């Protein structure tokens, strides 16, 4: 017999002790080496309830990533709480590695294996593991990058779809590469490339899936209504540099319905900023100009963060806008099938 519980997890990784890359260094001291032969026990005739939106594993990972970023991506100047902090800010080696989260003695992680599991409610096919899969602590807004894919159908995730204040996570079943590049020889200017044939077909499937959740209403996408640049644009870190990419073209209603002309390569305008709003929760940070040469990162778009327009209208359509900003949601998108329980 067991029961739902919360405890202090430990992390595991395949970090290299010789590596100067920031995630490797952190993991060397914070984590233990992974298990060569992991043990998964499928629980027969067992039905468990889950809730990805109230999973405290997310809280611990959040603390870890903040700790990672604070101790590794130090600004030249930190503007926070009326004060000003000037530090050394050397260029770093930056590339997220997979981090496993595991339970100590007396505790075990339960894993939901239902292929269409939406994040909350009962799960029929449950297994028992010590550690989660390898999760890369990728910090981004609007688009979830380099994450896991849904096994079968596209899955809509929300604590409550009828509540316009709750975040919506669209979990894709097919990756769509995003190829972002800052060329060699304005040094702050950059761009991301996406195959519009692949993206629009996926986006069409997203609208159809959303139709199933909102009574066959017309599904419409719009740009963000407002907010800081970190959320009104696709914000992410590539090779230590903070990227801001305009996603207006990524959500083209014209291409997902008269559907002729947008069948090619989509190029999003990006800019590398040295003055940023920190996601860690404080204020503004200042960094050195970008490194020289070719700055490039090819990522998998594996998820989308959305917010739905509220209001006492009466139309037969729902409007969705690229969301994000709550980085805890990023971890929720990978930790959704896990929950900690205590043995007796």
Partner 1 sequence: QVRLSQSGGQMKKPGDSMRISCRASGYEFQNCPINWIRLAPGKRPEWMGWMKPRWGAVNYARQLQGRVTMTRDMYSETAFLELRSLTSDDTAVYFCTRGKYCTARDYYNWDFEHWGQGTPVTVSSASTKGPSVFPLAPSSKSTSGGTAALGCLVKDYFPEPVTVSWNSGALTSGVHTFPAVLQSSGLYSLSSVVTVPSSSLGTQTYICNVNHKPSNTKVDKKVEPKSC
Partner 2 sequence: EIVLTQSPGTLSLSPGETAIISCRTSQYGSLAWYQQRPGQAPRLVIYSGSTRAAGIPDRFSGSRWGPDYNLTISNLESGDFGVYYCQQYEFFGQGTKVQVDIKRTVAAPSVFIFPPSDEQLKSGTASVVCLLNNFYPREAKVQWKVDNALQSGNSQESVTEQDSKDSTYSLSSTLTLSKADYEKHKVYACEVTHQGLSSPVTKSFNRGEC
Positions in the binding site for ligand NAG (CB under 6 A): 42, 95-96, 113, 118, 120-121, 125, 127, 138, 145-146, 153-154, 156, 158-161, 173-175, 179, 181, 193, 195, 197-198, 205, 209, 232-233, 236, 238, 246, 248-249, 252, 254-255, 261-262, 264-265, 297-300
Contact pattern for partner 2 over residues 112 through 151, marking x by CB under 8 A: ----------------------------------------
Nearest to 50 by CA among 129, 114, 143: 114
Is 322 an interacting residue with respect to partner 1 (CB under 8 A)? no
Nearer to partner 1, 33 or 310 (CB): 310
DSSP 291: P
Is 36 an interacting residue with respect to partner 1 (CB under 8 A)? no
For the CB of residue 310, give the shortest distance to partner 2 in the complex, in Å. 5
- Tokens 């060397």 correspond to 28
DSSP string, 11-60: EEE---TT--SHHHHHHHHHEEEPPSS---EEETT--EEEEGGG-THHHH
Is 314 an interacting residue with respect to partner 2 (CB under 8 A)? yes
For the CB of residue 138, give the shortest distance to ligand NAG in the complex, in Å. 5
Nearer to partner 2, 20 or 314 (CB): 314
φ/ψ of residue 32, rounded to 5: -110, 160
> Among the residues of the chain, which ranges form H helices?
22-30, 57-70, 196-213, 229-232, 328-335
Instruction: Kindly indicate which of the ranges 29-37, 162-170, 230-238, 332-340 contains the residues binding partner 2, using the contact rule CB under 8 A.
Output: 162-170
Q: Encoding tokens for residue 312?
A: 């006492």
Q: Encoding tokens for residue 283?
A: 């204020």
Contact 334, 135 (CB under 8 A): yes
Instruction: Kindly indicate which of the ranges 157-165, 176-184, 185-193, 334-342 contains the residues binding partner 1, using the contact rule CB under 8 A.
Output: 157-165
Nearer to partner 2, 6 or 159 (CB): 159
For the CB of residue 267, give the shortest distance to ligand NAG in the complex, in Å. 9
Q: Please tell me the distance from the alpha carbon of residue 327 to that of residue 309, in angstroms, as a whole number.
A: 21
DSSP 331: H
Q: Encoding tokens for residue 134?
A: 């390898």
Candidate residues 228, 257, 294, 316; the one interacting with partner 1 per rule CB under 8 A? 228
Is 164 an interacting residue with respect to partner 2 (CB under 8 A)? yes
């Amino acid at each position: 017999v067991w029961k739902d519980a919360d405890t202090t997890l430990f992390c595991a990784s395949d970090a290299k002790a010789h590596e100067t890359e920031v995630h490797n260094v952190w993991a060397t001291h914070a984590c233990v080496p992974t298990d060569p032969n992991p043990q998964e026990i499928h629980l027969e005739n067992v039905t468990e309830n889950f809730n990805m939106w109230k999973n405290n594993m997310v809280e611990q990972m959040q603390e870890d990533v903040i700790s990672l970023w604070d101790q590794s991506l130090q600004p030249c100047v930190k503007l926070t709480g009326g004060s000003v902090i000037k530090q050394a800010c050397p260029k770093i080696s930056f590339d997220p590695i997979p981090i496993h989260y595991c339970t100590p003695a007396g505790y075990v992680i339960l894993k939901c294996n239902d292929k269409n599991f939406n994040g909350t409610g009962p799960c029929k096919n449950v297994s028992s593991v010590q550690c989660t899969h390898g999760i890369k602590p990728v910090v981004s807004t609007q688009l979830l990058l380099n994450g896991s894919l849904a096994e079968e159908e596209i899955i809509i995730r929300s604590e409550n779809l009828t509540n316009n204040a709750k975040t919506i996570i669209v979990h894709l079943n097919k990756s769509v590469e995003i190829n972002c590049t800052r060329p060699s020889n304005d040094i702050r200017k950059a761009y991301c490339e996406i195959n519009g044939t692949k993206w629009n077909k996926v986006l069409k499937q997203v609208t159809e899936k959303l139709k199933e959740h909102f009574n066959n209403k017309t599904i419409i996408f719009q740009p963000p209504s407002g907010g800081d640049l970190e959320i009104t644009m696709h914000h992410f870190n590539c090779r230590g540099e903070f990227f801001y990419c305009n996603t207006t073209q990524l959500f083209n209603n014209t291409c997902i319905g008269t559907m002729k002309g947008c069948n090619g390569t989509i190029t999003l305008p990006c800019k590398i900023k040295q003055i940023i709003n920190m996601w860690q929760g404080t204020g503004q940070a200042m960094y050195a100009p970008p490194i020289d040469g070719k700055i490039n990162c090819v990522s998998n778009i594996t998820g989308i963060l959305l917010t739905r327009d509220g209001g006492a209208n009466n139309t037969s359509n729902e409007t969705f806008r690229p969301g994000g900003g709550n980085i805890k949601d990023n971890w929720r998108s990978e930790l959704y099938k896990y929950k900690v329980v205590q043995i007796e």
